[PDB]
Amino acid sequence: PIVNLQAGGRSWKAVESVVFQQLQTVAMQHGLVSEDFERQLAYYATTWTSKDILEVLAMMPGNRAQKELIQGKLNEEAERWVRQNPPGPNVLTVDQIMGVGQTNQQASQANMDQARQICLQWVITALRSVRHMSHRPGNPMLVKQKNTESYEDFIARLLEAIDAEPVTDPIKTYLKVTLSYTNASTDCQKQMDRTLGTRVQQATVEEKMQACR
Amino acid sequence: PIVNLQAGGRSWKAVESVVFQQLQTVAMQHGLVSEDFERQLAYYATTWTSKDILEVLAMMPGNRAQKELIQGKLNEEAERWVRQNPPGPNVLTVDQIMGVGQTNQQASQANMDQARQICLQWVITALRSVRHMSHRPGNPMLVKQKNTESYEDFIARLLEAIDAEPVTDPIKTYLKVTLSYTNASTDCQKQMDRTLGTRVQQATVEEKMQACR
Amino acid sequence: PIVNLQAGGRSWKAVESVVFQQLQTVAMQHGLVSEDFERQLAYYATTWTSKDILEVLAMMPGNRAQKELIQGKLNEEAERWVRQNPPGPNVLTVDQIMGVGQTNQQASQANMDQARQICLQWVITALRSVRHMSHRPGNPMLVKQKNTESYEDFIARLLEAIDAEPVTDPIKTYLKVTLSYTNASTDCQKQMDRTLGTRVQQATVEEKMQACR
Amino acid sequence: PIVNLQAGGRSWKAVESVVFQQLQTVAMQHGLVSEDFERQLAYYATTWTSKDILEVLAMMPGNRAQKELIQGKLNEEAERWVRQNPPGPNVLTVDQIMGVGQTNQQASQANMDQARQICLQWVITALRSVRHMSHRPGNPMLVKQKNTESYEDFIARLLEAIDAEPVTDPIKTYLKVTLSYTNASTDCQKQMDRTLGTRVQQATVEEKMQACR
Amino acid sequence: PIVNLQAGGRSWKAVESVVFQQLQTVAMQHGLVSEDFERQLAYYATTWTSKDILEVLAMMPGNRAQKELIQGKLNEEAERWVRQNPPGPNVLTVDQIMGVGQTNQQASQANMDQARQICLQWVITALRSVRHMSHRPGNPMLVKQKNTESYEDFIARLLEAIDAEPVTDPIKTYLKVTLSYTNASTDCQKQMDRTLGTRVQQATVEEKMQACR
Amino acid sequence: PIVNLQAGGRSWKAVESVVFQQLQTVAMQHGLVSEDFERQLAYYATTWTSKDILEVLAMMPGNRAQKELIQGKLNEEAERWVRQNPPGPNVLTVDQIMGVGQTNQQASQANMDQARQICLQWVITALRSVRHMSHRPGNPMLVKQKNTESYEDFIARLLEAIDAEPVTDPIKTYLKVTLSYTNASTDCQKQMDRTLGTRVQQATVEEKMQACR
DSSP states (O other), X not given: OEEEOTTSOEEEOOOOHHHHHHHHHHHHHSOSSSHHHHHHHHHHTSSOOHHHHXXXXXXXXXXXXXXXXXXXXXXXXXXXXXXXXXXXXXXXXXXXXXXXXXXXXXXXXXXXXXXXXXXXXXHHHHHHHHHHHHSOTTHHHHOOOTTXXXXXXXXXXXXXXXXXXXXXXHHHHHHHHHHHHHTSOHHHHHHHHHHHHHHHHHOOSSHHHHHOO | OEEEOTTSOEEEOOOOHHHHHHHHHHHHXXXXXXXXXXXXXXXXXSSOOHHHHHHHHHHSOOOHHHHHHHXXXXXXXXXXXXXXXXXXXXXXXXXXXXXOSXXXXXXXXXXXXXXXXXXXXXXXXXXXXXXXXXXXXXXXXXXXXXXXXXXXXXXXXXXXXXXXSOOOHHHHHHHHHHHHHHTSOHHHHHHHHHHHHHHHHHOOSSHHHHHOO | OXXXXXXXXXXXXXXXXXXXXXXXXXXXXXXXXXXXXXXXXXXXXXXXXHHHHHHHHHHSOOOHHHHHHHHHHHHHHXXXXXXXXXXXXXXXXXXXXTTOSOOHHHHTSTHHHHHHHHHHHHHHHHHHHHHHHHSOTTHHHHOOOTTSOOHHHHHHHHHHHHHXXXXXXXXXXXXXXXXXXXXXXXXXXXXXXXXXHHHHHHOOSSHHHHHOO | OEEEOTTSOEEEOOOOHHHHHHHHHHHHHSOSSSHHHHHHHHHHTSSOOHHHHHHHHHXXXXXXXXXXXXXXXXXXXXXXXXXXXXXXXXXXXXXXXXXXXXXXXXXXXXXXXXXXXXXXXXXXXXXXXXXXXXSOTTHHHHOOOTTSOOXXXXXXXXXXXXXXXXXXXXXXXXXXXHHHHHTSOHHHHHHHHHHHHHHXXXXXXXXXXXXXX | OEEEOTTSOEEEOOOOXXXXXXXXXXXXXXXXXXXXXXXXXXXXXXXXXXXXHHHHHHHSOOOHHHHHHHHHHHHHHHHHHHHHSOOOSSSOOHHHHTTOSOOHHHHTSTHHHHHHHHHHHXXXXXXXXXXXXXXXXXXXHHOOOTTXXXXXXXXXXXXXXXXXXXXXXXXXXXXXXXXXXXXXXXXXXXXXXXXXXXXXXXXXXXXXXXXXO | OEEEOTTSOEEEOOOOHHHHHHHHHHHHHSOSSSHHHHHHHHHHTSSOOHHHHHHHHHHXXXXXXXXXXXXXXXXXXXXXXXXXXXXXXXXXXXXXXXXXXXXXXXXXXXXXXHHHHHHHHHHHHHHHHHHHHHSOTTHHHHOOOTTSOOHHHHHHHHHHHHHHSOOOHHHHHHHHHHHHHHTSOHHHHHHHHHHHHHHHHHOOSSHHHHHOO
């Protein structure tokens, strides 16, 4: 974590042992590629140096292969960054962004603020990508209410499946509303279909949600 | 959390890991829509930026659908805010209030103090509204002393049922006093009815409370 | 908690999460009307704003009816305060004392110091009063050494019973000394009666205490 | 706890919740009259105000009668203090020493430093005195090595028994050395008596201690 | 831990009890020679004095012989340092680097910053070396998918085996890709060999990883 | 703990409740005379006043006799200090060193820095001496590989036995290397004796250590 000195100079601080242990238990119960770890790491890594965004991630508990997969995806982000940003006189280098050969004080500098911001972004994209590798194709379509599962529970699973997929907002909204009625059990889809006629199939996320419960 | 610098400038701080873990255990035992989480979040979110009122809520443990329901209600609050406050030159935008595209420092500014205040208000209304969706109609009327439940316990349940409903104070008071005698078991309602005659039915919250126990 | 700024201005702070959790476990094991919670809340609520003396109490775990009983007694304190202190030009209002419509900064002001002091006093009186409602009449007189209970234990129970009652010091002392010999088992009251003759009945709290054990 | 302001003025602070919980667990496992609580309270009560030396003691977990016994002994200390120090123009009053009718700030003042020092001293004497009441007469003499208890263990119990008694240093030393050989089991007292002849009975605390084991 | 005084002078601080306990539980579950302890110690030992890099390591829980092995390897590093850096007028001495006969303040000085940096480096090399002693020769080659172990799990074990070996990056990459197909079970190596023909054997770390699962 | 004021004056602080509890659990699991407690106490007692080096030790959990043995040895250190340092005009007194009749502020002074340094040294020597009393003579020689114990484990026990003895470095090195082969089981001592001939008996700590495992 960068510390802003009262003099205005900037020095470094070891990650607060409270925050580190906080992220670890969220990477030990949910996983280091799980969204819960991704959400907590991004909020607390705002002050983290490019050096502390990589070292802490490595220390976090996870399967050895997953760290290979994450650094593998992370290397994919770096090569992409070099291609999108051609070598330039003051342009950052993958090493500068990956905190290579920098003392913590030099990696906590303002010039490494862009570097720390760029680094954290690559890790989140890789984890979303490592997470996508776990997801099989068409998870939402396969999900249904087997054994007449609670309409609430079924919608929770369907929401997880759309959230799993990286489809963009305009298409994320299409899927949630469309799949909820289609994959619903005949008992409540049928009663709602008569209850709200065409409209229930029209909009299903909220109006259909309250009716089935 | 906004931090007020001695210089008078304002900077940001990651939510204290003590407070975050505090709210989470109250959102993991009672629920993230439960009143206990709503009370603790409001007290500790006074300093929270518009950005930290949304990110922390998302990190808190809850059913996936409930977060959809909360953001669904939260979007209802935003559209209502735009209609009630027409677009204006210095008027806040739903994005400004929802901390969109703002760095933590820029979201911890005084101009975002109104934005953070407006944001927190929407979340509480949604949760009360998400909570109301769980409540069926006429919960207090259905509540009674089945199996001669302790008059204390029965009043506790009845108080919870009025608190559940969003009826206004003048009508919240009507219900508590009225339903306590009506739904009471014959044994103690009858003995009190003879004991205090007309007055016991007149006022039931305190005088009837001590007598039945 | 009010924080006294070095500049001399006064700002507010969310109740330290260490102290809050401390009072809660004493309101979850002993009760929120129990003396143990009352003692810890008064010591730590010295800096608490009128707003933080009410919000934290509400968050503390307790039966729903008990909070009704506490706010019921608290309203009794407020109406009494208005009658004893007639409306005046600079006189505090029940709202000012109950931290109504005040921002935390404005409720942490010196002018609200009297208000915070007055508020805390009402809550303690109500809890003592809520606690008295639980106590049946003449608890000390009924208490005896059934099954020849340890004279120490019996005196502990008798001391609890006098402490329960709100009798004033001059009469609190009368009861402890008087009831200890009268309610004592025949075996040790008789042996002490011969051992110290008239004096043992004269003074019973300390001289009789050591002899029976 | 008094806090020394940088300006040189002195203000008050609620007992650190870390220290309070520390003393409580030592008053919940060993007892509030036990030496372990007495040792920890004295070390941490150096900064405690006369008001915080009494309130925290009351909050600590203990049998109700024991608090009566401690305040009983504490009142014995106060009456003795008045007799030894006759009423004087600037002489402290039992109330001033017992933090009566003083705001925490006024009880954290330098003039209350003597008062806080005098108060803490009375509580320790009472607890030693409350502890003595538990001790029966001649505990060390009765202690022996029943069933050939480890000479180490037997000396531990004997040391506890002399420590229990308030005999002065010149007589505390007499007892430890004298009782260790006398109460020892015949097997090791006899072998040592031949082994070191007259000297072993002469000095028994260290030379006899190593030999029996 | 060195503390940088506002005056610019430098003083010492006892290792934060939060960080110490953090490293110990990682040296009590994984081992004091395990990579997990090595990663956490290096990140938190940035501020540690040469004196605190040795004392804390000794306090950490481990087999007695392992500390002999670590100090044995540590002495190997020191003799090597003397040979590589011949005695010089301002050149550091193994004692200066090993914080011998220095007060904490004098060991927290800027001149001991190089000494603290040099010390920490030796300990990590020894632990990697102590860890290598545990590793038998050719661990990766022996590792295979016995009982058709998950291709993911098998790659995790193989990655651990290459990480175990101190082979340099150019040869670390050769091994991971080469051994994954060779040691794979016939069922998935065969199906992949037909699926991707020559290329699957060409590159096996990522393309073969997703296909077998 | 002494606190160095910004003004340059020095005041006292109650031992951080985090560090105290840290040492206690190491004096409750390993013992208050065990090396683990001795190592942690020395590192954290650098700032401790002469008064806080004695009071905290007494509070730490231990057998009553052991504290007698430790203060017994501590008195041995004091009498030795008086003899080695004859009474002098500015020479420290055992009382000054043992923090007798000094207020914490006066015991936290620079003139008591030598006194605090001298005090801590005596306690460590006594504990090493109290620990030696537990050790019987010739512990390393008696230690062997009974039931063919792991050569690693056997060397761990032998290293503990030499560490137990206070023999000086030149003779500590002689013992470890000499006893490891002599007390080894015939199976691995014999195979090593043929494997490395005369040299294996020559040096046994490292070369023989790797070979037997």
